[PDB]
A and B are shown apart, each in its own frame.
Chain A
Amino acid sequence: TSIMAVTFKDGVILGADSRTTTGAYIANRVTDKLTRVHDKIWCCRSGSAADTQAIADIVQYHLELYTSQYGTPSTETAASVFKELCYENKDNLTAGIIVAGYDDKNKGEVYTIPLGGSVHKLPYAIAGSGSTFIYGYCDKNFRENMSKEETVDFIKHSLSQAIKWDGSSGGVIRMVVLTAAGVERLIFYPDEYEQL
């Protein structure tokens, strides 16, 4: 798995590959790892698929019930609910989640929640098995307040390399753009990104 979330001028973009493996067999080559817990709060899932789905389903439930009572939750609030589940059940979970969301007040925010259940607010985040291969690349090429087109290229180039080196990563590059304008889904096929 190669997943990332990147803040930029207009908001935030989440990106992911589409490969799910059982050992060396690719169980699903068109997986959707970008998952919606609220209108403009999404997350990228890594680790046990069962665990991250079970968590994401519970968070979506909590934020739906939050919205009914208190109105739209902040991205920080969503990250806190993810954290609370991950931290309190750390002995029984293998979940590495990146939370990304758009407020109008706070604009684009990214929170990463690694195995332990700690929270870390960051300008961008990378995770999953394929992320190890792009720490160098992402650190050198990330800038703050990029445009939408620059951020799409940054994610596309980054995950292209993660896919190239990681066997556990592959397939299509899915992306989800979160701005004031709304929610845009993007897809990029092998014939496009491999030749970069």
Chain B
Amino acid sequence: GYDRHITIFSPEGRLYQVEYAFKATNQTNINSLAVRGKDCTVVISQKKVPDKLLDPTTVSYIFCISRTIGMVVNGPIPDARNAALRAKAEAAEFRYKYGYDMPCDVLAKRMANLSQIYTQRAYMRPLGVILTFVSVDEELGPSIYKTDPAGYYVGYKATATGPKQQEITTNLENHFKKSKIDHINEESWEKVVEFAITHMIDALGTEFSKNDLEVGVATKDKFFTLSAENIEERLVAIAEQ
């Protein structure tokens, strides 16, 4: 049964190492969510600092890939950082060669093609991560594109990733069935972050303090992460209505 150890086909036409890499994705037990506003793209992710000895400021699964592109990872941190460093290198090389900022969807495709190579070439293992790329693209507007260990990628109106992704997904599905639009009809990103947090609270059934969340926001010409105090301001506004 060596068809389960390397990336070759099983008799069923399956790649077991790819399937097991998908399982490694949930090893962190962290749930992420991404939504789009009018002018922005918001990504939120659970933050869990179990050890008191840890420096909580260094515990993060959100990465600033370029000025415009942000990336949240669902999976172990070594593979997450492997993917982050590569995406940063690719985004920089793109800008140098072609004279404009790498689009979110093109980076996603590039990383997905790299992921595909690990599913076809035996000596390289798949990375056990799901990469969710976010930006406000200058042509396509607010953008969410997600990559997995299979090398699959697609654009999203909104998305969720983690152990409890299905609960978050259906919550978001039901909202967009009502509104009948592809985005959160909201002017400020602050209110789009409030929406994202609110709908994660409803979906997961858990309350959040400032240290339990981690937020990334993409606007036109920059992506940034919120501090604990910026999130606290968000949590106060949710509670007050």
A55-70 interface code vs B (CB 8 A; 1 in, 0 out): 0011011001100110
The stretch that binds A, out of B86-94, B124-132, B158-166, B167-175, is B86-94
Per DSSP, chain B at the interface is helix
Q: B134 at the A/B interface (Cβ < 8 Å)?
A: no
Per DSSP, chain A at the interface is helix
Across the interface, which residues of A come within 8 angstroms of B92, CB to CB? Answer: 61, 64-65, 68
Interface residues on A, range: under 10
Identity of the chain A residue whose Cβ is nearest the Cβ of B91 in the assembled complex: A68
Per the bound structure, the CA–CA distance linking A69 and B84 in Å amounts to 9
Across the interface, which residues of B come within 8 angstroms of A60, CB to CB? Answer: 96
**Is B85's CB under 8 angstroms from A69's CB?**
yes
A26-41 interface code vs B (CB 8 A; 1 in, 0 out): 0000000000000000
Per the bound structure, the CA–CA distance linking A69 and B88 in Å amounts to 8
Across the interface, which residues of B come within 8 angstroms of A58, CB to CB? Answer: 96
Across the interface, which residues of B come within 8 angstroms of A57, CB to CB? Answer: 96
Question: Smallest CB–CB gap between A97 and chain B, Å?
Answer: 18
Per the bound structure, the CA–CA distance linking A58 and B97 in Å amounts to 10
Across the interface, which residues of B come within 8 angstroms of A64, CB to CB? Answer: 66, 92, 95
Per the bound structure, the CA–CA distance linking A64 and B94 in Å amounts to 11
Q: B107 at the A/B interface (Cβ < 8 Å)?
A: no
Identity of the chain B residue whose Cβ is nearest the Cβ of A62 in the assembled complex: B92
Per the bound structure, the CA–CA distance linking A79 and B240 in Å amounts to 51
Identity of the chain A residue whose Cβ is nearest the Cβ of B64 in the assembled complex: A68
**Is A61's CB under 8 angstroms from B85's CB?**
no
Question: Smallest CB–CB gap between B95 and chain A, Å?
Answer: 7
Q: B65 at the A/B interface (Cβ < 8 Å)?
A: yes
Per the bound structure, the CA–CA distance linking A93 and B117 in Å amounts to 39
Interface residues of B in 56-91 (CB under 8 A from A): 64-66, 85, 88-89, 91
Where the two chains meet, the residues of B that have a C-beta atom closer than 8 Å to any C-beta of A are: 64-66, 85, 88-89, 91-93, 95-96
> What 5 pairs across the A-B complex have the smallest Cβ distances?
A68-B88, A65-B92, A61-B96, A64-B92, A61-B92
Known: A60-B96, A61-B92, A68-B66. 14 other contacts (CB 8 A): A57-B96, A58-B96, A61-B93, A64-B66, A64-B92, A64-B95, A65-B88, A65-B89, A65-B92, A68-B64, A68-B88, A68-B91, A68-B92, A69-B88
